[PDB]
Design an enzyme around this catalytic site. Structure first.
Site, PDB file in Angstrom:
ATOM      1  CB  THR A 194      -0.973   0.123   1.300  1.00 33.09           C
ATOM      2  OG1 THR A 194      -2.160  -0.765   1.047  1.00 33.09           O
ATOM      3  CG2 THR A 194      -1.342   1.429   1.690  1.00 33.09           C
ATOM      4  CB  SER A 195       1.729   3.622  -2.371  1.00 33.03           C
ATOM      5  OG  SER A 195       2.578   2.530  -2.444  1.00 33.03           O
ATOM      6  CE  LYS A 205      -4.855   0.209  -0.896  1.00 29.33           C
ATOM      7  NZ  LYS A 205      -3.467  -0.141  -1.093  1.00 29.33           N
TER       8      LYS A 205
END
EC number: 3.4.25.1
Lengths: 204, 233, 243, 244, 198, 244, 222, 196, 250
Positions: free
Chosen positions: H1-2, H33
């Protein structure tokens, strides 16, 4: 270690033409030591039959529990519990102990007294129902039983024929399992009558 | 009237009064007299001990709460034991957790709040005892007056118990004088004994009848009874 | 024996005096309110009376924003009213958390009515001396008005009124609907529905209103809000240019 | 506080009597009569249904006779709903005993347990007693056929014949008059019906106003059987005994 | 483990239990009676975990004596064994289980027949002509399988046990210091004080 | 009948709660206290009766602080007032712990409100015997409130309670009319001192001690502080002067 | 096990294979894996069989009660929220992995739920051991605006991928179609491509083949 | 995840990739997200999906109740609620939340609550497994008070790099813009950001 | 705080009466009339929708409620008490039966559960009895159709047909004349409408009357197809229109 392999034992049930069969071995051991050759694993409440494999102490406790619950059920409902209903009662009773389960393999057999339809069912130790129409197997020699049943079984067998089939399935499965055997009993069930027979088998 | 509204502490009378509390206050007036007064360096408690028979002892009226705090009672002795004990623990908590001596002002607030709870709930009863708290903390000498109603007041001097009104008037007159009795304990005590004897009537303060307590600048709270109070009679 | 009048137990006539007396308390404020349904909105109007000159008028209200979509007007003493409002807000927030969607006006009304029923049956709890009118534009039912009382009773309305002069408002409203033959105000804007409401409030009570004699709440798709004194004045002006 | 509204259901009167128990018994005295008669070869339970109508479904009804065990039954006099509460706990106690010892519960042990429950509401808790009186009919392999009675006080006793509910005085006198130790179930059945027939506050004794049950050890078997008569069966036995 | 043997003959049940109590490297006692009378016609022998053993036995004894006084009756052996099974079955699923195995020998005065029950710490119950707990069974069940008969007399039963004990004293590693033998029949419980050489 | 006034949560036939009304009597019997809302803060002042020369002056503080930005003063049963402030403090700490920001006056007002109202719901507790004036500064302005024993409260421009509440209210009403643009913190303080002196005439028999506190965005940085020394004397004089 | 969910222009469809196993043994060759939460909210699970069944019936029971209490049709987001909050509380110990689909007054929905309590939303999903074989198919043929018939085909094709390539799956394909304005239609054994060929011989035994030791009648009637 | 949040002239922007994995398998390639806890308060989640969803759901609950009683909550208050949940339950949670919201008084703000449950107010913040690869890039290219277009570009470039090197990140780049003007949803596809 | 009312509010009086139960029964008597008639192939329960104002929407207030798909209920007395009893009844049908046996409870048993709830409000500490009487109608495989009445005391009895509330005495008499064991559902519906007409003062139509039946299974009300054994609910509430069509043949 494995609660399900301490005492040994097997149970199998089959449906036929307007009839059902439930059978079990009679052994009760403690690891390699054979202790009793009269430990029956099939019980009945009214016309509903229950077979239980696994840890002997739980086999006994469960029988007492279901006798207790079916007795109250009859007093309140004013009728004997049916196969389908009892199967749900077993399932919910087992799932209630989801994280401290009874180490058993229950099997239900019987004929609905109103529809005359033959019924059987199996469960894992926490209540999952397996509702096969042909046969249900349980115990330390379950792989063997699956093998025999799948080979020997055929639809709509007459009581007298189903008896030969269920028996041969039980006997030959038991003989390839060290923790199973030492005697066996078979129940042939019909709407009106139930016959119980003790089979002759190897005693080793 | 009254009879219908004095059944418990949870009932207000039509004029806004709390009779159970007022009755508890009455147990104080029936109690033996005790006086309290302070200067800028010391605080003093003087109490008249009461006896049952001439074959019994004179029940103590002064209780030590810590090295810098103490009190005198008037009314139900058991309630004084409960309250002084709560104060002992509060003084204790302050020392153990903050290494700090409990301010007399704070002790008064804690006593007030503890008493109040017993005047608003069902089943309980108000405390039936009055208390005079003296102590020497980081802001000097102190004297507090505690009433079962929960009202706590800081004074230069005061008195509670039967005929307490005599000593109270005398102190309210002697004010300018005793308030300056600094660095001289014996004088502050005599000033207190003179105040208490202003409420006598029955007898005269004797040796096993008088009880004195003092706390101050370089004086831990100490209690004087019997022979030790002879030089003041 | 005579204590069947102090707590919520039956009297020989099968009555609950404490509940009846709680109903009496709802009129203690001497205020009247009414609610009506538009084509796609719901309006609640309530008299506003500020006797004391020392009071900050902005803090005197009997209308509450329960959730983004539900409004509630109360008839009864303000402390019991705020007790009901806090509970209703909590119930609405909790419902959204647990069930994943906004609590419907009628469901919150039922829930509050059930809570009231309990005070009616359990001795240690007293009834709240209030009547609660809930409004909104439900996503399934459209414009909605549901009112609950100290007996635990609740029902939906086409329009309703509560207060000392409740009856006069009610018959006035009934007459209007017997005439129009529809169960709502046939107006597209909520502004005109507010005007209709204020208009019939005046006719029934036989009184004139200034911008500070009323309090107004409006419910639209996805939002319930209250009008400011000025938004109200704008409303009063418009009704003035018709009479 | 609350103390103001507390009736104090569990205190003694100056005479050493328990108010609530005495008043519950007064309540019982207005309920349909129930009779129990013990014979050498069985037991009979008979009860009069209080209040009835043409539209009352009698086939699906049960308000006085309840099965507790396969070997024990009770006849009820009083608040039906209070009775169902106690009946259910008795049914539980019986199953618990069977689970523990793998033997049916002895009649007296189950009776004592229910009586103890009743006694409790008499000494602590501040709740009203149960407005119920029971007649227990059961069989066990230690005392054979047994008949017991329990009331709101928690006291219980055994009998050869007994009645509870309305007009027990008149009924007890009649039973004491025609009862004989060597009686037989069929004699008992007749004695029961005759007695109810003379004590009824009603016009005539019809089948729709009765509930009947017997506990016999049907010779052709060897076990004990409970028979809760059906409407038609009561109608029959009513004609045979000459009451038509 | 300790030696616990039981055998049901024609009109009685015989229980044999080893007398040694060994802790680590020392035999602390050689006259230990590993039994408790539950009622005049019911006897229970036990073996297992050090403290749990007696605590369980005495607890069961107390409960049965209480039942006897309350009812002025004696519970049948089968009833007692069921009560004992439930207690052990509850224990296996508790915080700290009783690690105790038992044999219950009783004479049912109503049926006029002796009965022998074997129950392990899990609550596993079975009724048998003869039984044993621990390692004993490994040498005795084949002996009894060979020499046992249903119509044996109390005396033939005692000779059968003597045979079992001799085999145990020959093949088992531990010195259990002999056994104490008790007979349960229609007249109650008596101890055969002469087995040290019968 | 009667007796509706003997238990706290009972509704009388006219829908009232007499115990709450009696609590109000305890309040009216108390010392007078007030609050004045100014253009950027609030001022609180109270009358402290001098029972005798023995009371150490300036030592029996009655005004209390909640958190660091709220002031509370009350008339009636002093212990009940403290009880309420203790709760107020726990209430404020709880709000700050969860939301970080110090509690808004309106939010704080309802916290005290709900708690006080709660004490009119059961007969197991007694209503609060005090009326409380409190307020302070927050994110959007100054706020002044008064809470009655019924749990009722509203925002105010000026408020008063206790013995001389009428005089005070009359004075507060004049100020509201002659200052529509808003009073200044400095002015409010003096004005407060005056109002208390005038309201002291309803208790002119005993001598009294003045106590004032304030919370102003400009004068105290929005924190509650007591008026002491010079600012206090200057206010006492302003009053002593206009009392003649 | 192979279960899939596919959204189409006016609804959503879910399907699953019918093989139930105990380790490497097939216990039930035709069990039904499609469960009902409410009339129009259907479910399919993988993982601990007892858990998916129990969690489905519990939330189903509560959904019914909620529906009766609010006088409204059950919403999929409610079943989702109740299932996830229940599973989270049990920190993954209730091994239920599910694909829930359905229609309600607000439209058509498709979600996946994991044992620990996390949820996802999508147009096409797969779960179970056959998860990857089914997803290979969905990623190759799915497209926006599928018709009811195209969705049934796609979903059915995805499960076949599982039946044929995943050892944990087999036998038949079950389907359930939920369309916005109609009743949900459950199609048990929509496909049966795995029929057992006739056996080479009959194993019926001649009566008397089994040796019996003792016989007797059993009493059923009381 | 970023994931990342960046304050700028007109407010604040939240950005994230859309990849969720269980091992090497991509369980969802279009995950969202960017989570809304209030009209103008949003957060980016990292760590256990079950945990962060449970926390966000509870925070949303707390903020809805807060609003009903006291009006619109400050971004700081929202970050405080997240913190209270993360700190007090640090033993049973694995959650890294970035909180970002727009206030009319305070404009845009960014708070990061890392694993332990501590809180940090920052001009911009980056988190998730992919963030390690863009620490240098972000520290060299971030400037305060950038325009909307510049900020979108900053996030787009930063995340494309994070996605380039981190196998746990990928899919589309989602953004949420929070200003007085309202809430705007942006999406950027591979064919675009991959060739930057 | 804390409920300190742990003692009974219903106690025996010297005459043996339980005052609170008698008084609850009196509240039931003042209530709007409701009735029930059992036919050979169904059951009908009905009552009057005594709207408390013409501005009120009488449909948003259901006096007849579904408890299980084959069981319905109606009442006389205190509407709010009824409402919570329905919530509890629906729940206990699940917690004490469906979650154990996987099927809905037979009518008598659910009635038994409701009755237990009501009995407890007669003895438990700090409460008053429910001020309602219920008429519960249902069907189950082994008992067929049935109709029960449950009173404030917790007592319950089966009926062929009966009425409760305001004019129950007159209505019961009118039912005794028209009832026979050969009635078909439509006949019972007709009899129900006639009986109810004597109890109603003002308007008598499908908008002022609330009526439901327990009849055949309604596959169209199930919500899904594909399972043969699941045929649908037997409980069905008649529509305002269905009621009017039958009023013309009155």
């Amino acid at each position: 270690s494995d609660p399900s392999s301490i005492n040994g034992g097997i149970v199998v049930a089959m449906t036929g033409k307007d009839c059902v069969a439930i059978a079990c071995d009679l052994r009760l051991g403690s690891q390699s030591l054979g202790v009793s050759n009269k430990f029956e694993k099939i019980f009945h409440y009214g016309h509903v039959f229950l077979g239980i494999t696994g840890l002997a102490t739980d086999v006994t406790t469960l029988n007492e529990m279901f006798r207790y619950k079916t007795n109250l059920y009859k007093l309140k409902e004013e009728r004997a519990i049916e196969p389908e209903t009892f199967t749900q009662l077993v399932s919910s009773s087992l799932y209630e102990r989801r994280f401290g389960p009874y180490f058993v393999g229950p099997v239900v057999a019987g004929i609905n007294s109103k529809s005359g339809k033959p019924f059987i069912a199996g469960f894992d130790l926490i209540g999952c129902i397996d509702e096969a129409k042909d046969f249900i197997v349980s115990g330390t020699a379950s792989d063997q039983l699956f093998g025999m049943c799948e080979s020997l079984y055929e639809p709509n067998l007459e009581p007298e024929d189903l008896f030969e089939t269920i028996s041969q399935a039980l006997l030959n499965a038991a003989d390839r399992d060290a923790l199973s055997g030492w005697g066996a009993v078979v129940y042939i069930i019909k709407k009106d009558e139930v016959v119980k027979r003790y089979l002759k088998m190897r005693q080793d | 009237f009254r009879n219908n509204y004095d059944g418990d502490t949870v009932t207000f009378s039509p004029t806004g009064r709390l009779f159970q509390v007022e009755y508890a206050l009455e147990a104080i007036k029936q109690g033996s007299v005790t006086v309290g007064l302070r200067s800028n360096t010391h605080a003093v408690l003087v109490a008249l001990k009461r006896n049952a028979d001439e074959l019994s002892s004179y029940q103590k009226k002064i209780i030590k709460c810590d090295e810098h705090m103490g009190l005198s009672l008037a009314g139900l002795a058991p309630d004084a034991r409960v309250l002084s004990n709560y104060l002992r623990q509060q003084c204790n908590y302050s020392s153990l957790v903050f290494n700090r001596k409990l301010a007399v002002e704070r002790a008064g607030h804690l006593l007030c709040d503890k008493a109040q709870k017993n005047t608003q709930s069902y089943g309980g009863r108000p405390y039936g005892v009055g208390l005079l708290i003296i102590g020497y903390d980081k802001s000097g000498a102190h004297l507090l007056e505690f009433q079962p109603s929960g009202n706590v007041t800081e004074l230069y001097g005061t008195a509670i118990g039967a005929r307490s009104q005599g000593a109270k008037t005398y102190l309210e007159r002697t004010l300018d004088t005793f308030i300056k009795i600094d660095g001289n304990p014996d004088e502050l005590i005599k000033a207190g004994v003179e105040a208490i004897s202003q409420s006598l009537r029955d007898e005269s303060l004797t040796v096993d009848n008088l009880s004195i307590a003092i706390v101050g600048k370089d004086t831990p709270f100490t209690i004087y009874d019997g022979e030790a109070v002879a030089k003041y009679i | 024996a005579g204590y069947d009048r102090h707590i919520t137990i039956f009297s020989p006539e099968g009555r609950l005096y404490q509940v009846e007396y709680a109903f009496k308390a709802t009129n203690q404020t001497n205020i009247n309110s009414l609610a009506v349904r538009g084509k796609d909105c719901t309006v609640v109007i309530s008299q506003k009376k500020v006797p004391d000159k020392l009071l900050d008028p902005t803090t005197v209200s009997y209308i509450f924003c329960i959730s983004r979509t539900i409004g509630m007007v109360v008839n009864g003493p303000i402390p019991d009213a705020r007790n009901a409002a806090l509970r209703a807000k909590a119930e609405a927030a909790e419902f959204r958390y647990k069930y994943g969607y906004d609590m419907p006006c009628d469901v919150l009304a039922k829930r509050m009515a059930n809570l009231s029923q309990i005070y009616t049956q359990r001795a240690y709890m007293r009834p709240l001396g209030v009547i609660l009118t809930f409004v909104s534009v439900d996503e399934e039912l459209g414009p909605s008005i549901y009112k609950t009382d100290p007996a635990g009773y609740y029902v939906g309305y086409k329009a309703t009124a509560t207060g000392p002069k409740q009856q006069e408002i009610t018959t006035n409203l009934e007459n209007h609907f017997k005439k129009s033959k529809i169960d709502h105000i046939n107006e597209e804007s909520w502004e005109k529905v507010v005007e209709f409401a204020i208009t019939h409030m005046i006719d029934a009570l036989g009184t004139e209103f200034s911008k500070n004699d009323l309090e107004v709440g409006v419910a639209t798709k996805d939002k319930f809000f209250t009008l400011s004194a000025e938004n109200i004045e704008e409303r009063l002006v418009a009704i003035a240019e018709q009479d | 506080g609350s103390r103001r509204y507390d009736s104090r259901t569990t205190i003694f009167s100056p005479e050493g009597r328990l108010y609530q128990v005495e008043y519950a018994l007064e309540s019982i005295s207005h309920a349909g009569t129930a009779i129990g008669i013990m014979a050498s070869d069985g037991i009979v339970l008979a009860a009069e249904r209080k209040v009835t109508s043409t539209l009352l479904e009698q086939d699906t009804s049960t308000e006085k006779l309840y099965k507790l065990n396969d070997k024990i039954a009770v006849a009820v006099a009083g608040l039906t709903a209070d009775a169902e509460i106690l009946i259910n706990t008795a049914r539980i106690h019986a199953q618990n005993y069977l689970k523990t010892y793998n033997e049916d519960i002895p009649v007296e042990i189950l009776v004592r347990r229910l009586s103890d429950i009743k006694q409790g509401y008499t000494q602590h808790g501040g709740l009203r007693p149960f407005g119920v009186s029971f007649i227990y009919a059961g069989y066990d392999d230690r005392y054979g056929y047994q008949l017991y009675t329990s009331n709101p006080s928690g006291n219980y006793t055994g009998w050869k014949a007994i009645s509870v509910g309305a007009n027990t005085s008149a009924a007890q006198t009649l039973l004491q008059m025609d009862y004989k130790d060597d009686m037989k179930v069929d004699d008992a059945i007749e004695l029961a019906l005759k007695t109810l027939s003379k004590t009824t506050d009603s016009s005539a004794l019809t089948y729709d106003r009765l509930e009947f049950a017997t506990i016999r050890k049907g010779a052709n078997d060897g076990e004990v059987y409970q028979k809760i008569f059906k409407p038609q069966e009561i109608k029959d036995i009513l004609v045979k005994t000459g009451i038509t | 483990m300790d030696i616990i043997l039981g055998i049901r003959v024609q009109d009685s049940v015989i229980l044999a239990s080893s007398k040694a109590v060994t802790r680590g490297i020392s035999v602390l006692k050689d006259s230990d009676d590993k039994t408790r009378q539950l009622s005049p016609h019911t006897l229970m022998s036990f073996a297992g975990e050090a403290g749990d053993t007696v605590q369980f036995a005495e607890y069961i004894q107390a409960n049965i004596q209480l039942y006897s006084i309350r009812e002025d009756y004696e519970l049948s052996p089968q009833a007692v064994s069921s009560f004992v099974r439930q207690e052990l079955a509850k224990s296996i699923r508790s915080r700290r289980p009783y690690q105790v195995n038992v044999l219950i020998g009783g004479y049912d005065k109503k049926k006029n027949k002796p009965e022998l029950y074997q129950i392990d710490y899990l609550g596993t119950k079975v009724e048998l002509p003869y039984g044993a707990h621990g390692y004993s069974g490994f040498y005795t069940f084949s002996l009894l399988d060979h020499h046992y008969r249903p119509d044996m007399t109390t005396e033939e039963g005692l000779d059968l046990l003597k045979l079992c004990v001799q085999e145990l004293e020959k093949r088992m590693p531990m010195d259990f210091k002999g056994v104490i033998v008790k007979i349960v029949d229609k007249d109650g419980i008596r101890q055969v004080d002469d087995f040290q050489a019968q | 009948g009667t007796g509706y006034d003997l238990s706290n949560s009972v509704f009388s036939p006219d829908g009232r709660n007499f115990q709450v009304e009696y609590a109000v009597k305890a309040v009216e019997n108390g010392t007078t206290s007030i609050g004045i809302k100014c253009n950027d803060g609030v001022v609180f002042a109270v009358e402290k009766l001098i029972t005798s020369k023995l009371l150490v002056p300036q030592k029996n503080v009655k005004i209390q602080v909640v958190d660091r930005h709220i002031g509370c003063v009350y008339s009636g049963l002093i212990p009940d007032g403290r009880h309420l402030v203790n709760r107020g403090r726990e209430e404020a700490a709880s709000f700050k712990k969860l939301y970080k920001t110090p509690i808004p006056i309106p939010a704080f007002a309802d916290r005290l409100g709900q708690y006080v109202q709660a004490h009119t719901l059961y007969n197991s507790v007694r209503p609060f015997g005090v009326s409380t004036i409190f307020g302070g500064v927050d994110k959007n302005g100054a706020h002044l409130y008064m809470l009655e024993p019924s749990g009722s409260y509203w925002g105010y421009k000026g408020a008063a309670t206790g013995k001389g509440r009428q005089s005070a209210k009359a004075e507060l009403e004049k100020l509201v009319d002659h200052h529509p643009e808003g009073l200044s913190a400095r002015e409010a303080v003096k004005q407060a001192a005056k109002i208390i002196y005038l309201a002291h005439e309803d208790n002119k028999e005993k001598d009294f001690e003045l106590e004032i506190s304030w919370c102003s965005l400009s004068e105290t940085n929005g924190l509650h502080k007591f008026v002491k020394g010079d600012l206090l004397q200057e206010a006492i004089d302003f009053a002593q002067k206009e009392i003649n | 096990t192979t279960i899939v969910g596919v959204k189409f222009n006016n609804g959503v469809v879910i399907a699953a294979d019918t093989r139930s196993t105990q380790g490497p043994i097939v216990a039930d060759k035709n069990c039904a894996k499609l469960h009902r939460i409410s009339p129009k909210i259907w479910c399919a699970g993988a993982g601990t069989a007892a858990d998916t069944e129990a969690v489905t019936q519990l939330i189903g029971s509560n959904i019914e009660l909620h529906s009766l209490y609010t006088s409204r049709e059950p919403r999929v987001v409610s079943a989702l929220q109740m299932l996830k909050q229940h599973l989270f509380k049990y920190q993954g110990h209730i091994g239920a992995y599910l694909i829930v689909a359905g229609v309600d007054p607000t439209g058509s929905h498709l979600f996946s739920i994991h044992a620990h309590g996390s949820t996802d939303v999508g147009y096409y999903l797969s779960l179970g051991s056959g998860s990857l074989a089914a997803m290979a198919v969905l990623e190759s043929h799915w497209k926006q605006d599928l018709t009811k018939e195209e969705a049934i085909k796609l979903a059915s094709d995805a499960i076949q991928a599982g039946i044929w390539n995943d050892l944990g799956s087999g036998s038949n394909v079950d389907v359930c179609v939920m369309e916005i304005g109609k009743d949900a239609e459950y199609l048990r054994n929509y496909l049966t491509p795995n029929v057992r060929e006739e056996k080479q011989k009959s194993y019926k035994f001649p009566r008397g083949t089994t040796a019996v030791l003792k016989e007797s009648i059993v009493n059923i009637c009381d | 995840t970023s994931i990342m949040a960046v304050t700028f002239k007109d407010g604040v922007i939240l950005g994230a990739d859309s990849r969720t994995t269980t091992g090497a398998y991509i369980a969802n390639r279009v995950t969202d997200k960017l989570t809304r806890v209030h009209d103008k308060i949003w957060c980016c989640r990292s760590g256990s999906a079950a945990d962060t969803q449970a926390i966000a759901d509870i925070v949303q609950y707390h903020l809805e109740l807060y609003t009903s009683q006291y009006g619109t909550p400050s971004t700081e208050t929202a970050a405080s609620v997240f913190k209270e949940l993360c700190y007090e339950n640090k033993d049973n949670l694995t959650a890294g939340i970035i909180v970002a919201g727009y206030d009319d008084k305070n404009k845009g703000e960014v708070y990061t609550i890392p694993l332990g449950g501590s809180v940090h107010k920052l001009p911009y913040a980056i988190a998730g497994s992919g963030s390690t690869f863009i620490y240098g890039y972000c520290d060299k290219n971030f400037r305060e008070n950038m325009s909307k277009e510049e900020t979108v570009d900053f996030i787009k470039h930063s995340l494309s790099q994070a996605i380039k090197w981190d196998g746990s990140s990928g899919g589309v780049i989602r953004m949420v813009v929070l200003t007085a003007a309202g809430v705007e949803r942006l999406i950027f596809y591979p064919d675009e950001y991959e060739q930057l | 705080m804390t409920d300190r009312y742990s003692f009974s509010l219903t106690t025996f009086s010297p005459s043996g009466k339980l005052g609170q139960i008698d008084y609850a029964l009196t509240a039931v008597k003042q209530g709007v009339t409701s009735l029930g008639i059992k036919a050979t192939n169904g059951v009908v329960i009905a009552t009057e929708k005594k709207s408390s104002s013409p501005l009120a929407m009488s449909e948003t207030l259901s006096k007849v409620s579904l408890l299980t798909p084959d069981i319905g209920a109606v009442y006389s007395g205190m509407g709010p008490d009824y409402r919570v009893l329905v919530d509890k009844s629906r729940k206990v049908a699940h917690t004490s039966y469906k979650r154990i046996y996987g099927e809905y409870p037979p009518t008598k048993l659910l009635v038994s559960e409701v009755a237990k709830i009501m009995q407890e409000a007669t003895q438990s500490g700090g409460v008053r009895p429910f001020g309602v009487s219920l008429l519960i109608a249902g069907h189950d495989e082994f008992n067929g159709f049935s109709l029960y009445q449950v009173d404030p005391s917790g007592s319950y009895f089966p009926w062929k047909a009966t009425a409760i509330g305001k004019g129950s005495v007159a209505a019961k008499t009118f039912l005794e004349k028209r009832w026979n064991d050969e009635l078909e559902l439509e006949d019972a519906i007709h009899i129900a409408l006639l009986t109810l007409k004597e109890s109603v003062e003002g308007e008598f139509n499908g908008d002022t009357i609330e009526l439901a039946i327990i009849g055949d299974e309604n596959p169209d009300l199930l919500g899904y197809t594909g399972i043969p054994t699941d045929k649908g609910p037997r409980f069905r509430k008649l529509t305002s229109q269905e009621i009017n069509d039958r009023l013309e043949a009155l």
